[PDB]
Enzyme design. Sequence first.
Site, PDB file in Angstrom:
ATOM      1  N   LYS A   1       0.854  -1.167  -0.137  1.00 55.85           N
ATOM      2  CA  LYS A   1      -0.115  -0.063  -0.022  1.00 55.85           C
ATOM      3  C   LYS A   1       0.866   1.349   0.132  1.00 55.85           C
ATOM      4  CE  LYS A   1      -0.333   0.396   5.061  1.00 55.85           C
ATOM      5  NZ  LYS A   1      -1.367  -0.089   6.289  1.00 55.85           N
TER       6      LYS A   1
ATOM      7  N   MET B   1      10.712  25.535  -1.386  1.00 49.88           N
ATOM      8  CA  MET B   1      10.051  24.558  -2.408  1.00 49.88           C
ATOM      9  C   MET B   1      10.889  23.751  -3.310  1.00 49.88           C
ATOM     10  SD  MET B   1       6.507  25.218  -4.538  1.00 49.88           S
ATOM     11  CE  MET B   1       6.273  26.630  -3.103  1.00 49.88           C
TER      12      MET B   1
ATOM     13  N   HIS C   1      -5.857  -6.683  13.108  1.00 50.33           N
ATOM     14  CA  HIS C   1      -4.950  -5.782  13.348  1.00 50.33           C
ATOM     15  C   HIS C   1      -4.719  -5.351  14.701  1.00 50.33           C
ATOM     16  CE1 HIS C   1      -1.892  -3.659  11.132  1.00 50.33           C
ATOM     17  NE2 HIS C   1      -2.455  -2.311  11.453  1.00 50.33           N
TER      18      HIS C   1
HETATM   19  C1  LIG Z   1      -0.404  -0.898   7.007  1.00 54.16           C
HETATM   20  C2  LIG Z   1      -1.175  -2.247   7.472  1.00 54.16           C
HETATM   21  C3  LIG Z   1      -0.123  -3.545   7.743  1.00 54.16           C
HETATM   22  C4  LIG Z   1       1.282  -3.408   7.516  1.00 54.16           C
HETATM   23  O1  LIG Z   1       1.964  -2.710   8.641  1.00 54.16           O
HETATM   24  P1  LIG Z   1       3.471  -2.709   9.077  1.00 54.16           P
HETATM   25  O2  LIG Z   1       4.165  -3.787   9.024  1.00 54.16           O
HETATM   26  O3  LIG Z   1       4.048  -1.710   8.005  1.00 54.16           O
HETATM   27  O4  LIG Z   1       3.530  -1.871  10.509  1.00 54.16           O
HETATM   28  C5  LIG Z   1      -0.740  -4.777   8.071  1.00 54.16           C
HETATM   29  N1  LIG Z   1      -2.026  -4.938   8.098  1.00 54.16           N
HETATM   30  C6  LIG Z   1      -3.083  -3.775   7.895  1.00 54.16           C
HETATM   31  C7  LIG Z   1      -4.410  -3.993   8.053  1.00 54.16           C
HETATM   32  C8  LIG Z   1      -5.468  -3.892   8.128  1.00 54.16           C
HETATM   33  C9  LIG Z   1      -2.471  -2.310   7.481  1.00 54.16           C
HETATM   34  O5  LIG Z   1      -3.296  -1.370   7.471  1.00 54.16           O
END
Ligand SMILES: *Cc1c(COP(=O)(O)O)cnc(C#C)c1O
Lengths: 387, 384
Positions: B41, B314, B170
């Site tokens: 992402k 900038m 999460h």
């Molecule tokens: C951003 C994320 C992640 C990965 O997190 P990090 O390893 O970079 O700290 C894993 N799962 C979810 C969800 C739902 C996330 O938004």
Amino acid sequence: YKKAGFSDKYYRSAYMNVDLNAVASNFKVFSTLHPNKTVMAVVKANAYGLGSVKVARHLMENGATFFAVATLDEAIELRMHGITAKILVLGVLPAKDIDKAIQHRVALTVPSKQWLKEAIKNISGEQEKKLWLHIKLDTGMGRLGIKDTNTYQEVIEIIQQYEQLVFEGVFTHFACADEPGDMTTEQYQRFKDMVNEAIKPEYIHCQNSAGSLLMDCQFCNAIRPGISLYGYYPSEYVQQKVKVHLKPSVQLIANVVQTKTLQAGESVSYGATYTATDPTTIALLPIGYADGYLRIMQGSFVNVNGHQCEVIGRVCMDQTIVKVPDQVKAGDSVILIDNHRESPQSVEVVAEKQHTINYEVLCNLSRRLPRIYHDGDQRFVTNELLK
Amino acid sequence: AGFSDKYYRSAYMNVDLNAVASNFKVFSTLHPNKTVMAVVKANAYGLGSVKVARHLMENGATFFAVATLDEAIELRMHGITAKILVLGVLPAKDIDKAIQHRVALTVPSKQWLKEAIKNISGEQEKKLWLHIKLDTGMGRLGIKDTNTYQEVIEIIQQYEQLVFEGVFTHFACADEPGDMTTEQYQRFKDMVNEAIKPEYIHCQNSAGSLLMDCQFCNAIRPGISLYGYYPSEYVQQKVKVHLKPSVQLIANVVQTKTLQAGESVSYGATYTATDPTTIALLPIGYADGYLRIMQGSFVNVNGHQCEVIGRVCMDQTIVKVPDQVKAGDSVILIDNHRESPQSVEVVAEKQHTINYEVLCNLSRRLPRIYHDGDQRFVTNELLK
Ligand SMILES: *Cc1c(COP(=O)(O)O)cnc(C#C)c1O
Ligand SMILES: *Cc1c(COP(=O)(O)O)cnc(C#C)c1O
Ligand SMILES: [Cl-]
Ligand SMILES: [Cl-]
Ligand code: NA
Ligand code: NA
Ligand code: NA
Ligand code: NA
């Protein structure tokens, strides 16, 4: 699935509204203040986040004939998308790339005698069109430019020995045009003093947004307004001194995707950094710091259906949590940045929260936000992920 | 055709793809019986989602996660054939595009799923892969009660087009000490054990993947640590694995000047030298993600530690330098080492933020120059 022809699609309810009519309106303010000057519209840094291609194109439809950008990449991007106005690169081109500037009919800045000699050595002969040059004078800023008259004269004499090189322009830049004090007056006088010791070029320019709003500068025949084209005053001081009205061109919007009720004890986001004491309702917005709504925005206020609501808990990469009244529900739209100066969601208030200036708030807005452009009743979209 | 392989300003990111593959391989070695769902992402945390995903597929990756459907479609347009999960909430009106492009979606609530069903037109007849999000304490997206979780599965089971592919949660505090992570993990099992189990069960980010086994789960979602950064100093101190940082931020000096005593530099005249001192102009500024607050930090010019002086503009940064520095010398602003005065973490301290944000700030105007062994590839997004 392929690239869209006219309007990119987008699949998350978070976006920038960009008012092109506001931008044209502000451009027209400047040409009215300076009726005998070329308005060299500054569209660097992707038009301060609005989209350099769309803005340039719209400004050309409204009489703009000259643009300035920071880099040759920015200039070539304009050329690839049909911009036929003159373009000046304000930064320093690598000498090895001189043939690409000539090929694409882009004017360059001369910062020093040494640069010009390097640039000449890298001209192959394969691109035979004229190379338009604007000499940068350092009049006290201490950044780029030639600071002494003898060097200025030597540079012009070098340009005059080559039929391919054109002395198109000379310019300087003000450090403190947006604060009170004498430095701007002194720089302007110094600029005249130097320019009067040599043959004059077609274009003579020194004024940014602040200089264009506070001074005539009859000696100059072109102006370089940036941030005020997009509807923002370069400082509070300038806003207070001048009677012209500028129209802000950006909104930052997101729609609520889920609401929840937290019980006393339950926490929200990373690090358990907000803990509910009462039954309180929260709203999840699909926007975060990877979009440019930075972590420091925690504790600021946003506008949900007219109500002022606190951003609570950690701002995540992709999500923001907001404390809301019970009647708020999924699908309600939220103004995070508003197109009004006198607003608790103004760009300037957001800048205060970020401990920065309006310029940076706009540049932070990332490629992941679609830009939705408004021109009268027409609506079209740029989403960089799907280009 | 574009010129996206070319670039015309001496300021850029080096992205070490072998470092990224190496870190991916660390995680699959720590969790040999789990699918590594690589989180790419936010444009792979600023490295470039397309190039990273493609490189990871060449090294065995079969599943990716992204925040938005736009990010997933971007991967599909550029040849990614792995499974993809969108972690955010898709607008129900756009359900047909997820089905068409074979992208798995997150179910955050029972109401969403009903809206999504109503917007299925019949024109896209392929299966819709669904991963149900459980809120186990984070307080953000997902279902928090077991009965709702069960009802959602029962709805999915009545439609042949809808597949219950996965379930997940999460962690809020996996990178700090304390009981919260243990409690969330137990809650997650408690919920998941009251219903039929799907193919994929996942709960661990980078921090959770480095600190816990979680045998119950069969997939992991590492993000920032794929790119070579520990999610907190606490984690770095607890774990014995070495992660290889993947980013350098570089710029070359374009002009030097000598200031006499009295003479100043940049906006607002915030700096005067008072001695014969040399300065260097770098063609990089806050529109590139090197923010204004970086004033007063240190950068590396030919080995020498040099102060960033004056206002960061900038498009330009000014640096106080030794006399021998000249135009063309390269400057490391962010370095690919953890123990460096130019590390991502030191830059994060200066910005009063975390490493994640330092990387995400890096704007589209910086070219990404990828290294894979001795092979070199360039993305410059302006020249698409
Ligand atoms: C951003 C994320 C992640 C990965 O997190 P990090 O390893 O970079 O700290 C894993 N799962 C979810 C969800 C739902 C996330 O938004
Ligand atoms: C950024 C810039 C501008 C425009 O300044 P603002 O109007 O946004 O304050 C004008 N001239 C130069 C030069 C040289 C710039 O770099
Ligand atoms: Cl005039
Ligand atoms: Cl395992
Ligand atoms: Na000439
Ligand atoms: Na605005
Ligand atoms: Na929490
Ligand atoms: Na089914």
